[PDB]
Ligand binder design. Structure first.
Ligand SMILES: Nc1nc2c(ncn2[C@@H]2O[C@H](COP(=O)(O)OP(=O)(O)OP(=O)(O)O)[C@@H](O)[C@H]2O)c(=O)[nH]1
Ligand SMILES: O=C([O-])C(=O)[O-]
Ligand SMILES: [Mn+2]
Ligand SMILES: [Mn+2]
Ligand code: NA
Length: 619
């Protein structure tokens, strides 16, 4: 070097650039040159590091300690930074069609492509100087069990201590991962809240963010993820949606595996027979509650492998094996109670970070549906940091408030949840929020029909992103926000699985926990009662003659579902299938797939469309 090169050793306040693998050092120093942090902190993942970082944020007023619990914390964000923003989430490729199919008219509903040229301009308008006056934290993280050959390692640079703390829970993080990495490749992840000091704009709720310039970008051809302006975990915990769904789904297509928005659970019957199941439901549509359900049926047991992301690959014996690449649960808080999700309540009692929930005056947490009466005199601070009472018009917790909690604390975490070879999946469940028309459970007729059922998924909008109201949206495979490449090609890749050597193709089901009667009341109580539906699925996988053929697939025979203790359920409305509803449903799906998937729609999916239309027509 003729001066100091890109040597940023003088600014390192933890660790050493010298001890980094060469390529990690280059990534760090290149982005230090660009972003101009004051300091560089190389994370070690230690308890000491964690506790001190938390106590620092506390003194600053960035987070509060929840004094009622063992090592739990509460962050309240700027109300502009509360969920994913799909319209600001983009994938960069040379050709648009590699990222999304070209629709018959208008822009794709299956992702958002940005050209290399446009992204360069966007990047230059955001990143230079962005970390001035701040610390750049270097987070070495593993997606998958540490030192597993299945794992994928990343390095996330961020100026947000909230992100460091959340990454420690949600991934395997620290020096151990650098030691496991060695001179290997890693996913390059760059994050900034986009508020260099001195602040050009007023800071809201001590929550640094830049809503106007928020942009969550993926550059799969450069193995980079670059996210600006948002601290919300879906936008800032780059291992999770960005890497483990978007980047990984494209790698998966190329390499013969699958990366999916699915829980993985193990279920054991009263005879001690155990099976694993995967389930894809859209954001805020029930995965975490199923994955750690407490079954109401006696003698059944559920165990949790993962609640959100599954990586799956057929082995040589033909088993579809699944691993959970995450290390924690980043779960929707509202609705969570001892009644609905007791295993989550137990998990989150210690070492948990909450975002955008309410705080009680004795230092506990509160949210809609927590179903815990407070002692007279105890008062509530809403997520907006204002005094709140139960009869107030607005909720005390944001609808997308979250807990972020170690998976190892789940009282029913599966013994094999960190096994590198993964667990053998025998059933795949699809489903979402449909208040009308769609019955409690049905079973696909074949693998190709089941891929069609995944493709045809529709679900009421939730608060997990920017969609408002109760519009029923397409959300194929619960992947609409997450495809890393062209969805037509994704469908072809799923179809191609039918030919894996020795393949033991999982049975495919579709569920609906959310059908309502004419008064808006849920027809099905859900939560632990969903064990009744899992029982039926389990018997179907065992080959039990417990099903009746219908135009949409198989449903339970009369008396097949165990409804003991649920004698008030209206089985007729709940399982009702209307020709008029389904004729309209099939035409809507046909228009969506042909318009949005277009030249890239596989023949087999169009054939399943035709077949469903025909069976409905014979009603
Ligand atoms: N009525 C009803 N509500 C449910 C059921 N399961 C979950 N919910 C509610 O739906 C909301 C979201 O459920 P989660 O299990 O957190 O959803 P998720 O699929 O894990 O969502 P992401 O983490 O955003 O992917 C919570 O408010 C739950 O209480 C159910 O069986 N019936
Ligand atoms: O945060 C999530 O898990 C989501 O939006 O699906
Ligand atoms: Mn999710
Ligand atoms: Mn979840
Ligand atoms: Na705050």
């Amino acid at each position: 070097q003729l001066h100091n090169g890109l040597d940023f050793s003088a600014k390192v306040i933890q660790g050493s650039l010298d001890s980094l693998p060469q390529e990690v050092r280059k990534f760090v120093e290149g982005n230090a040159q660009l972003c101009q942090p004051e300091y560089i902190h190389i994370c070690d993942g230690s308890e000491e590091e964690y506790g001190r970082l938390l106590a620092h944020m506390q003194e600053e007023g960035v987070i509060r300690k929840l004094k009622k619990y063992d090592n739990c914390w509460l962050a309240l964000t700027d109300p502009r930074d509360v969920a994913r923003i799909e319209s600001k989430t983009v994938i960069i490729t040379q050709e648009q069609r590699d990222t999304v199919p070209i629709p018959k008219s208008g822009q794709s509903q299956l992702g958002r492509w940005m050209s290399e040229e446009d992204f360069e301009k966007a990047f230059n308008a955001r990143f230079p100087g962005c970390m001035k006056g701040r610390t750049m934290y270097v987070i070495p993280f593993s997606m998958g069990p540490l030192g597993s050959p299945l794992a994928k390692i990343g390095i996330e640079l961020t100026d947000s201590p909230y992100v460091v703390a959340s990454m420690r829970i949600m991934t395997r993080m620290g020096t151990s991962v650098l030691e496991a990495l060695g001179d290997g490749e890693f996913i390059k992840c760059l994050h900034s809240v986009g508020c260099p000091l001195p602040l050009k704009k007023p800071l809201v709720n001590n929550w640094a963010c830049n809503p106007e310039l928020t942009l969550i970008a993926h550059l799969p051809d450069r193995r980079e993820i670059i996210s600006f302006g948002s601290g919300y975990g879906g936008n800032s915990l780059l291992g999770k949606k960005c890497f483990a769904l978007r980047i990984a789904s494209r790698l998966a297509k190329e390499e013969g595996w699958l990366a999916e928005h699915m829980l993985i659970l193990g279920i054991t019957n009263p005879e001690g027979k155990k099976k694993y199941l995967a389930a894809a439901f859209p954001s805020a549509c029930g995965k975490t509650n199923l994955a750690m359900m407490n079954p109401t049926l006696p003698g059944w047991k559920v165990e949790c492998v993962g609640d959100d992301i599954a990586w799956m690959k057929f082995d040589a014996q033909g088993n579809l094996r699944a691993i959970n690449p995450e290390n924690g649960f980043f779960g929707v808080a509202p609705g969570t109670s001892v009644k609905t999700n007791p295993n989550a309540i137990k998990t989150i009692q210690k070492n948990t970070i909450f975002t955008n929930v309410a705080e009680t005056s004795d230092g506990g947490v509160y949210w809609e549906g927590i179903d815990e009466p407070l002692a007279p005199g105890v008062t509530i601070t809403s997520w907006k940091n204002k005094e709140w009472r139960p009869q107030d018009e607005e909720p005390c917790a944001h609808p997308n408030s979250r807990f972020c909690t170690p998976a190892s604390q789940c009282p029913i975490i599966d013994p094999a949840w960190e096994s590198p070879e993964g667990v053998p999946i025998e059933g795949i469940i699809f489903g979402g929020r449909r208040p009308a028309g769609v019955p409690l459970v049905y079973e696909a007729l074949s693998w190709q029909h089941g891929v069609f059922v995944g493709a045809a998924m529709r679900s009421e909008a939730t608060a997990a992103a920017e969609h408002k109201g109760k519009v029923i949206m397409h959300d194929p495979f619960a992947m609409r926000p997450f495809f890393g490449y062209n969805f037509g090609k994704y469908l072809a890749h799923w179809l191609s699985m039918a030919h894996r050597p020795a393949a033991k193709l999982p049975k495919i089901f579709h569920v609906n926990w959310f059908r309502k009667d004419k008064n808006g009341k849920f027809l099905w109580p859900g939560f632990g009662e969903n064990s009744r539906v899992l029982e039926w699925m389990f018997g179907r996988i065992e080959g039990e003659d417990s099903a009746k053929l219908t135009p949409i697939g198989y449903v339970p025979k009369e008396d097949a579902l165990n409804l003991k203790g649920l004698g008030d359920v209206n089985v007729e409305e709940l399982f009702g299938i209307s020709k008029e509803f389904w004729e309209k449903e099939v035409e809507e799906i046909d228009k969506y797939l042909e318009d949005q998937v277009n030249a890239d729609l596989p023949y087999e999916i169009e054939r399943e469309l035709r077949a469903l239309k025909q069976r409905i027509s014979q009603m």
